[PDB]
């Protein structure tokens, strides 16, 4: 029910939704070359996979809220045609979704949530029909799990020129693999306006601004999924484990080179400070010898030679004070040259350690690369296919049920069915190719049944039950 400063396509509007919802005011105009170029680069024919480029970084702690206990949202809009694989206009008015070549999603990489554009794999977006409001030019759109949108688009109006606190464009613009949890906290959609409204379709992506704690949960999840993947892909694992060694080695080389510079400069300063001390000491040694030369007047306050002696003392103090400053500078240089020598040596060490490390990696990469790898079709034969609900015979009418029993291997849950008016549960045992029956209320095992006939292959096992999963 509010209003917002006009924003341009690609711009990440930051706001803390009210009871009325989110306000979306778009400053129409061909998308910036900066964004358009990034998108162009992202589409570059890369290997199959979902790739992304982080456009903005979100900084929760910098959010200028009314009350820290709030839910801020970042809303990025783009012209629908720039996203959809096919012009939105050439789409049946009864379609609820549409394929897209790029989406703007929230992704977490290094303990930070960012707004990125991703592409490289087939994707679909919901098509939401915007509705009119009493206020002309103002439409409402309801996207799945997001506050109601009060969208407004103007052919030509000002545009916010600077990012709000909490969002920065200072990000690693390199193309990288989208995360496992990409878009985990984003809800997007192509918004199409009323028949004779005159507005072109607009893509809109709404992301929740995650808190430091929530960013951590995402990152831990990313980590766990990456590890599960590495655990099941020896080669791919060895690849990144080696690439990582390749980098750590290079970083160790730049390390030694940096320490060689520190040492070279330390030597230069050392010699220089040493010469200055050496010269300062000459002056001091001559002023001391001069007091000695006139010491014979040290007790004759009346003689003019006493003035020479007295003056000599003054010259000696001035020379000592200078020597003291010179000695301190030289000592600092000596400590620097010593630390630089140890650091350079230490860098030399780590660099060697890194060299061995990269060898173990470059070798293992080949060892695992020389092994036999089973193809997809092989995996498709490791377990027995599950029967189609309507093909399970001899058990009366069956209706699928929410999977819950954890699988022994892999990450799935056993396929579950319901029979006898929801009193009997049947789960598919893919390792033996048979159904296992269980009593609904008790969870107690009833036996093994053949899907083709419905006959009992084995009787009830008292030791088996799935009460823990209903």
């Amino acid at each position: 029910s509010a209003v917002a400063a006009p924003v341009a396509f690609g711009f990440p509007a930051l706001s803390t939704p009210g009871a009325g919802g989110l306000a979306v005011s778009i400053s129409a105009g061909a998308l910036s070359a900066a964004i358009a170029d990034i998108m162009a680069a992202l589409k570059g024919p890369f290997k199959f996979g979902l790739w992304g480029v982080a456009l903005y970084g979100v900084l929760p702690s910098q959010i200028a809220k009314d009350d820290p206990n709030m839910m801020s949202k970042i809303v990025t809009s783009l012209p629908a045609d720039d996203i959809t694989e096919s012009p939105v206009s050439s789409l049946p008015l009864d379609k609820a979704t549409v394929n897209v070549n790029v989406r703007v999603v929230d992704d977490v990489k290094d303990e930070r949530q960012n707004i990125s554009v991703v592409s490289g794999v087939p994707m679909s977006c919901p098509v939401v029909d915007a509705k009119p409001t009493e206020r002309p030019g103002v439409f409402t759109a309801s996207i799945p799990g997001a506050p109601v949108l009060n969208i407004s688009v103007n052919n030509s109006t000002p545009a916010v020129q600077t990012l709000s606190p909490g969002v920065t464009n200072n990000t690693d613009k390199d193309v990288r693999p989208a995360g496992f949890t990409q878009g985990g906290n984003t809800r997007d959609a192509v918004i199409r306006f009323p028949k004779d409204s005159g507005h072109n379709a607009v893509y809109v992506s709404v992301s929740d601004v995650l808190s430091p704690d929530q960013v951590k949960q995402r990152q831990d999840e990313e980590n766990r999924r990456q590890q599960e993947w590495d655990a099941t892909h020896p080669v791919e694992a060895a690849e990144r484990n080696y690439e990582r060694a390749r980098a750590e080695l290079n970083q160790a080389n730049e390390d030694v080179a940096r320490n060689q510079e520190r040492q070279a400069k330390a030597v230069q300063v050392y010699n220089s400070r040493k010469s200055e001390l050496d010269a300062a000491n000459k002056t001091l040694a001559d002023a001391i010898a001069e007091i000695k030369q006139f010491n014979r007047f040290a007790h004759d306050p009346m003689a003019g030679g006493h003035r020479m002696w007295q003056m000599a003392g003054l010259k000696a103090q001035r020379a000592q004070t200078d020597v003291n400053n010179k000695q301190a500078a030289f000592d600092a240089a000596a400590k620097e040259k010593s630390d630089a020598d140890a650091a350079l040596s230490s860098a030399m060490e780590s660099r060697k350690k890194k060299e061995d490390k990269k060898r173990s990696a470059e070798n293992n990469l080949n060892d695992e690369k020389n092994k036999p790898r089973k193809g997809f079709k092989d995996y498709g034969h490791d377990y027995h296919p599950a029967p189609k609900t309507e093909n399970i015979k001899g058990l009366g009418d069956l209706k699928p049920g929410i999977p819950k029993t954890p699988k022994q291997n892999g990450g799935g849950k056993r396929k579950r069915w319901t029979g006898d008016k929801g009193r009997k549960i049947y789960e598919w045992d893919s390792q033996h190719g048979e159904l296992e029956g269980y009593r609904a209320s008790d969870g107690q095992h009833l036996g093994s049944f053949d899907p083709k006939t419905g006959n009992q292959l084995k009787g009830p096992d008292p030791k088996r039950n799935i009460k823990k999963y209903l």
Binding site: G380, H384, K407, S430
Partner: protein
Amino acid sequence: GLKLDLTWFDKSTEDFKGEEYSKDFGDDGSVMESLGVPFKDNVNNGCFDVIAEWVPLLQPYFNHQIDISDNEYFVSFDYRDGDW
């Protein structure tokens, strides 16, 4: 070949509301790679919860319009030789 078996139930009643089979992908299981699901012990072996981030990646293969706000979705990766 490979088929995505999608099933969904009502969030509150937990009652079955529907099932749909995607087209046959033959021996192309790249779909599971986009979901980050290893092939090992997962083909013809389990149903997976359709988490939110996965909807945009799965919706292209199904006529049913996935609605995770009203239902709970599950998908299994079934493989049988040839057409079926």
